[PDB]
Swiss-Prot record:
Reactions listed under catalytic activity: a deoxyribonucleotide-2'-deoxyribose-5'-monophosphate-DNA + H2O = a 5'-end 2'-deoxyribose-5'-monophosphate-DNA + a 3'-end 2'-deoxyribonucleotide-DNA + H(+); Exonucleolytic cleavage in the 3'- to 5'-direction to yield nucleoside 5'-phosphates; a 3'-end 2'-deoxyribonucleotide-3'-phosphoglycolate-DNA + H2O = 2-phosphoglycolate + a 3'-end 2'-deoxyribonucleotide-DNA + H(+); a 3'-end 2'-deoxyribonucleotide-8-oxoguanine-DNA + H2O = 8-oxo-dGMP + a 3'-end 2'-deoxyribonucleotide-DNA + H(+)
Phosphothreonine modified-residue sites: T196
Site, Interaction with DNA substrate: residue positions: H272
Site (Transition state stabilizer): N175
Subunit text: Monomer. Homodimer; disulfide-linked. Component of the SET complex, composed of at least APEX1, SET, ANP32A, HMGB2, NME1 and TREX1. Associates with the dimer XRCC5/XRCC6 in a DNA-dependent manner. Interacts with SIRT1; the interaction is increased in the context of genotoxic stress. Interacts with HDAC1, HDAC2 and HDAC3; the interactions are not dependent on the APEX1 acetylation status. Interacts with XRCC1; the interaction is induced by SIRT1 and increased with the APEX1 acetylated form.
Residues annotated as binding Mg(2+) 2: D173, N175, H272
Organism, scientific name: Homo sapiens (Human)
EC numbers on record: 3.1.11.2, 3.1.21.-
Gene that produces this protein: APEX1
The protein, known as: DNA repair nuclease/redox regulator APEX1
Primary subcellular site in the record, as a coarse category: nucleus
Length: 281
């Protein structure tokens, strides 16, 4: 192809806020490409080293009634909530695992049409509400793009509702690289899932409407070659031909508490890498 390797070294963890407050909350999000596969690939060992307060997982591909026993070897994340497709099949799926129990856990976005594929978990805490999401892919041939646009609108309105009540943290695989800086090959992907004008625009609408700020891009507005997904094919990860599909979006009110937003480039076990947020809440 046209791309050789493009170097990217995620900056050291900045663990104090702009006002000097140490981070009190570390949240990790990871599209795991199958809970079972990932666990086999030692994903949990990496989680233990990272020691997040909250872990959010996407594409667990796992029935809520078929959770791997290994998930009980996680004492520091003993509160575990799962949402999988209603049809009880093994695809899509999200998880949220927390050191402390949330005040309330909910599933979906309150729209039956969009709530059957196990894509959203809402965990309300004292000072903020956390949402993790696995956003519907636009599909091969963009065959699912029309549905995706419906999803984007419903999701945006739902989140605007949440934020009207409490400061909001949204994380997960949002299945779009927002701008050209967010993927290695913008030119060749504008008609492919993840970089259509429609998807990018939906992301833009999401930021202004809630509103929300892109934590990573806020901190690193001019930083290129920072990605969270690489196709398993074509030796893409080795050449850093990737996409930033995984985000932490924050209510503006939370920006003063933002310490850092990390991309765990070296962490193996999926075709996405983990991302990690430090907040001083």
């Amino acid at each position: 192809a046209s791309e050789g390797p493009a170097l990217y070294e995620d900056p050291p963890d900045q663990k104090t806020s702009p006002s000097g407050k140490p981070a009190t909350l570390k949240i990790c999000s990871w599209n795991v490409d199958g809970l079972r596969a990932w666990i086999k690939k030692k994903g949990l060992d990496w989680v233990k080293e990272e020691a997040p307060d909250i872990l959010c997982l996407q594409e667990t591909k796992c029935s809520e009634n078929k959770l791997p026993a290994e998930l009980q070897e996680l004492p520091g994340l003993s509160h575990q909530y799962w949402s999988a497709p209603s049809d009880k099949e093994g695809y899509s799926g999200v998880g949220l695992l927390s050191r402390q129990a949330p005040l309330k856990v909910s599933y979906g976005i309150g729209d039956e049409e969009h709530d059957q594929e196990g894509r959203v978990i809402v965990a309300e805490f004292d000072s903020f509400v956390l949402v993790t999401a696995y956003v519907p892919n636009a599909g091969r041939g963009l065959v699912r793009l029309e549905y995706r646009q419906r999803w984007d609108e419903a999701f945006r309105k739902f989140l605007k509702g949440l934020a009207s009540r409490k400061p909001l943290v949204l994380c997960g695989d949002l299945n779009v690289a927002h701008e050209e800086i967010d993927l290695r090959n913008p030119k060749g992907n504008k008609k492919n899932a993840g970089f259509t004008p429609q998807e990018r625009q939906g992301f833009g609408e999401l930021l202004q409407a809630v509103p929300l700020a892109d934590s990573f891009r806020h901190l690193y507005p001019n930083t290129p070659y920072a990605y969270t997904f690489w196709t398993y094919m074509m030796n893409a990860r080795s050449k850093n031909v990737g996409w930033r599909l995984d985000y932490f979006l924050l209510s503006h009110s939370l920006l003063p508490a933002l310490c850092d937003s990390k991309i765990r480039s070296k962490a193996l076990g999926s075709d996405h890498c983990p991302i990690t947020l430090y907040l001083a809440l």
